[PDB]
Design a binder for this molecule. Structure first.
Ligand SMILES: C[C@H]1CCN(S(=O)(=O)c2cc(NC(=O)CN3C(=O)N[C@](C)(C4CC4)C3=O)ccc2Br)C1
Length: 130
């Protein structure tokens, strides 16, 4: 229905706003762009599902997220990919992991404060009906 289409359009506006607020935070600058393949050629071999906030925006605009749960799976993926590629005790790796964990925690905290549980539930029930 047009009412269901209006629901998913509201979800996209909400997800763009959350992603924008993460992307303008100076802590998260590294996560705003895909890994430069000329700068880091082995990334695409080690990390099987690369994800970054620019790709998250692309996926919102392509209607790939029908629930906030599906969006948070991609936020979780930025965090897990960061922990996987940068696992060492050195401060460079530890800073990336702390920033990755913070990006994930911030996304979940915004959604906890600002997502209506009944809105997510409606998205889930429209998704399941298809
Ligand atoms: C190579 C490491 C860096 C951190 N991780 S990550 O897995 O946490 C990760 C990185 C990225 N994007 C970028 O790194 C984009 N970028 C570059 O390719 N080079 C510069 C200029 C800078 C890094 C030297 C930069 O910012 C996106 C997502 C993750 Br999860 C991979």
């Amino acid at each position: 229905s047009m009412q269901e289409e209006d629901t998913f359009r509201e979800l996209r506006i909400f997800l763009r706003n959350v992603t924008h607020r993460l992307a303008i935070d100076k802590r998260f600058r590294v996560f705003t762009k895909p890994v430069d393949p000329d700068e880091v050629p082995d990334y695409v071999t080690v990390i099987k599902q690369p994800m970054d906030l620019s790709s998250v925006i692309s996926k919102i605009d392509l209607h790939k997220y029908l629930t906030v749960k599906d969006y948070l799976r991609d936020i979780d993926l930025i965090c897990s990919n960061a922990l996987e590629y940068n696992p060492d005790r050195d401060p460079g790796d530890r800073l990336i992991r702390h920033r990755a964990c913070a990006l994930r925690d911030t996304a979940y905290a915004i959604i906890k404060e600002e997502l209506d549980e009944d809105f997510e539930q409606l998205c889930e029930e429209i998704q399941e009906s298809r």
